[PDB]
Amino acid sequence: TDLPRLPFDNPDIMGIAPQMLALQKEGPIARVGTAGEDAWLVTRYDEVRTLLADRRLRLSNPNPQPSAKSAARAFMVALMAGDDHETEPARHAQMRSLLIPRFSTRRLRLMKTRIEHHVDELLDQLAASAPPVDLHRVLSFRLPTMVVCDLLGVPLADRERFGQWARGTFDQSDNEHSANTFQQVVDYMLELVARKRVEPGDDILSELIAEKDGALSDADIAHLGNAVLLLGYETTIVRIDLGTLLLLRNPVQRAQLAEDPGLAPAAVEEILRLGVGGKGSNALIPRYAHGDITVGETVIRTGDAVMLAIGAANYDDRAFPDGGLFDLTRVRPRSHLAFGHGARHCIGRTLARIELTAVFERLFRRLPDLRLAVPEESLRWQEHRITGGFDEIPVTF
């Protein structure tokens, strides 16, 4: 008897920690320690998917004496309208109602075209440069920040101002840095709302300003803009890096994709499913029980914390035969959980899929000799950031 303690060690730079796969083999749910509260850890696909659709399991904390959180986690929960369990139903419903129509089929088709041209240009710049090159700086970082500039209607150079703010806001190791970074985001967004009130364009804040004959306050609109800025590029950057690394590890699949770029949607779904970095603390969706819930033989009690391991569930052999293998020829794969499921299902997921498809349609056809310029083991996953990620990806080609 030894209580498992999150985060678990992972001897590889990607994948699922061995201890978490061991727990998955024993059963769907286990009690574990963490750096803070103890929590229920749910690791099997069926149970994670069921619990993500359970309205009794919510982001907000219902407890009278709530455990202390990092500034970074507090900001993340507040951006997601989860900071007050009594107002979360109305506030979260409004948040999704206001953001979902900002990603319309008209907008996504226009952005798909612009994204494809931008990838072409980014890869031409890359191909013309002298290796070794940092792929993270010149490709992974550049496409999703371009997209956020487009969503917000700001000059592309603005991403040189805001490009580190998601990392800084979500730095769990430094509350002062987290809070100072978030104030920069807030000031920038309030400036942007005031500009869009007199100079609107085809962009998200302009649409929110016009919503309900201007019924929303500038603070309400800036709040939603802050969610788009802080959630809308960093995780996509991380998936471009993880997808590149996964494809570099699987040369037979990589050659399949280079030969037939029509395999890119299937590759993107495998990248999302398998793309887990380091100790994988970002591949856990946190919840609190607002009512008692039974999982198998186990009772989750009102007030308990729950970690839904979407990463482990996406590796679950019960849901994906040979679940640890990258295979873009899977026939009718189950829907992975990398965008979540249920009430808080990723709002940007169709846009994120368009970005990743445009990149991986092109990458290995444009740079067939691309490969790491350093050992994989030298790549360092940043455990202190809620969103993890690598800081650099040196390549040659």
The residues that touch ligand HEM, with contacts defined as CB under 6 A, are 59, 80, 96, 99, 227-228, 231-232, 235-236, 239, 285, 338-340, 344, 346-348, 351-352
Part in contact with ligand 7PF (CB under 6 A); list of ranges 28-36, 290-298, 312-320, 386-394: 386-394
Burial of 191 from C-beta contacts in 10 A (0-12 / 13-18 / 19+): exposed
Give the residue with the Cβ less far from ligand HEM, 140 or 181: 140
Q: Tell me the closest approach of the beta carbon of residue 194 to ligand 7PF, in angstroms.
A: 26
Beta carbon of residue 366, minimum distance to ligand 7PF (angstroms, whole number): 27
Query: For ligand HEM, which is the closer residue by CB, 71 or 237?
Result: 237
* Beta carbon nearer to ligand HEM, 290 or 344: 344
Partner from ligand HEM, ligand 7PF, none contacting 314, C-beta within 5 to 8 A by type: none
Looking at residues 276 to 305 of the shown chain, list those that interact with ligand 7PF (rule: CB under 6 A): 282, 285-286
201-216 burial, b at 16+ Cβ within 10 Å, e below that, comes to eebbbbbbbebeeeeb
Q: Under the criterion CB under 6 A, does residue 308 sit at the interface with ligand 7PF? A: no
149 assigned to a ligand binding site: no
Say if CB 282 and CB 386 are below 8 A apart. Answer: yes
CB closest to ligand 7PF, residue no:
282
Nearer to ligand HEM, 220 or 397 (CB): 220
261 forms part of the interface with ligand 7PF (CB under 6 A): no
What span, in angstroms and rounded, lies between the C-alpha atoms of 52 and 337?
A: 10
Radius of gyration, alpha carbons of the chain: 21
DSSP state, residue 58: E
Shortest separation between residue 36's beta carbon and ligand HEM, angstroms: 17
> What are the two backbone dihedrals, phi and then psi, of residue 300, each rounded to the nearest 5 degrees?
-85, 125
Residue choice 181, 235, 250, 357 for contact with ligand 7PF (CB under 6 A): 235
Alpha helix positions (H), the chain: 18-26, 45-52, 71-79, 88-99, 105-127, 135, 142-152, 159-162, 165-169, 175-198, 204-210, 218-231, 234-249, 251-259, 264-274, 310-314, 349-366
| Residue 282 contact among ligand 7PF, ligand HEM, none, beta carbon within 5 to 8 Å by kind | ligand 7PF
How many whole angstroms separate alpha carbon 219 and alpha carbon 77? 17
Taking a C-beta distance cutoff of 8 angstroms, is the pair 264, 361 a contact? yes
Q: How far apart are CA 385 and CA 231, in angstroms?
A: 13
Instruction: Tell me the two tokens of residue 254.
Output: 């990589």
| 114 close to 144: Cβ distance less than 8 angstroms | no
Among 387, 390, 393, 395, binds ligand 7PF (CB under 6 A): 387
Asked if 386 is part of the footprint of ligand 7PF (rule: CB under 6 A), the reply reads yes
Q: Residue 345 Cβ, how far from ligand HEM at the closest point, in Å? A: 7
Residues followed by a break in the chain (C to N exceeding 2.5 Å) are: none
The residues in 131-150 that bind ligand 7PF, with binding defined as CB under 6 A, are none
Helices (H), 250-348: 251-259, 264-274, 310-314
**Which residue lies nearer to ligand 7PF by CB, 51 or 386?**
386
**No. of helices (H) and no. of strands (E), the chain:** 17, 10
Nearest-angstrom CA–CA distance, 113 and 55 = 38
| Closest separation in Å from C-beta 326 to ligand 7PF | 19
What's the closest the beta carbon of residue 154 comes to ligand 7PF, in angstroms?
21
Measured from the CB of residue 323, what is the shortest distance to ligand 7PF in angstroms?
Answer: 19
Name the residue number minimizing CB distance to ligand HEM: 348
Question: According to the binding rule CB under 6 A, does residue 231 interact with ligand 7PF?
Answer: yes
Q: Does 306 bind ligand 7PF (CB under 6 A)?
A: no
In contact, 38 and 305? CB cutoff 8 Å = yes
The answer to whether 116 and 358 have CB atoms below 8 angstroms apart is yes
- The nearest distance, CB 344 to ligand 7PF, in angstroms, is 8
Q: Per DSSP, what are the bridge partners of residue 58?
A: 288
Binding residues: 346
User: Rule CB under 6 A: which residues touch ligand 7PF?
Assistant: 231, 235, 282, 285-286, 386-388
